Write a protein that binds this DNA or RNA. Structure first.
Ligand SMILES: [Cl-]
Ligand SMILES: [Zn+2]
Ligand SMILES: [Zn+2]
Ligand SMILES: [Zn+2]
Length: 116
DNA sequence: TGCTTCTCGCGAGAAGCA
DNA sequence: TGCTTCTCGCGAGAAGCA
């Protein structure tokens, strides 16, 4: 196998046999275990780097295009990810984006083709 | 440094199957 | 197909470099 189950109080966890990490969702555990097996590879279309998770590759690639999908709605400035946007708003606007705040807009990804 | 890269539950599309 | 199963984007707190 790649995991074993661990049931406490009827709550089911899925444990990675390699690093004993705990996962509520099995799909989560798979996504993780690929970093141990490298069974699937996610090569960047723009350079030679390869990634063990699809989302790593996607963040990387969007970084290649320079696209700025995250826009502060308080002053209009755009940012390439959640952390720059959040850091901006907290610091400049002394406000917290977390939750249904409507303090930022996430634009569709246009600089390359991903799910939407 | 307060500010890349990591983490994974959640659920919406995409792919697989019939 | 319409039904299910799978993929992975996303938030946002956390760990990690330097
Ligand atoms: Cl842009
Ligand atoms: Zn593991
Ligand atoms: Zn690349
Ligand atoms: Zn702003």
């Amino acid at each position: 196998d790649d995991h074993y189950e661990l049931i406490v109080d009827g709550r089911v966890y899925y444990i990675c046999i390699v690093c004993k990490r705990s996962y509520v969702c099995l799909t989560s555990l798979r996504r993780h275990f690929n970093i141990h097996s490298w069974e699937k590879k996610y090569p960047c279309r723009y350079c030679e780097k390869v990634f063990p998770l699809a989302e790593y590759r996607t963040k990387h690639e969007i970084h290649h295009t320079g696209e700025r999908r995250y826009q502060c709605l308080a002053c209009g400035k755009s940012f390439i990810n959640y952390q720059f946007m959040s850091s901006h708003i907290k610091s400049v606007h002394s406000q917290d984006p977390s939750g249904d705040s409507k303090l930022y807009r996430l634009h569709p990804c246009r600089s390359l083709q991903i799910r939407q």
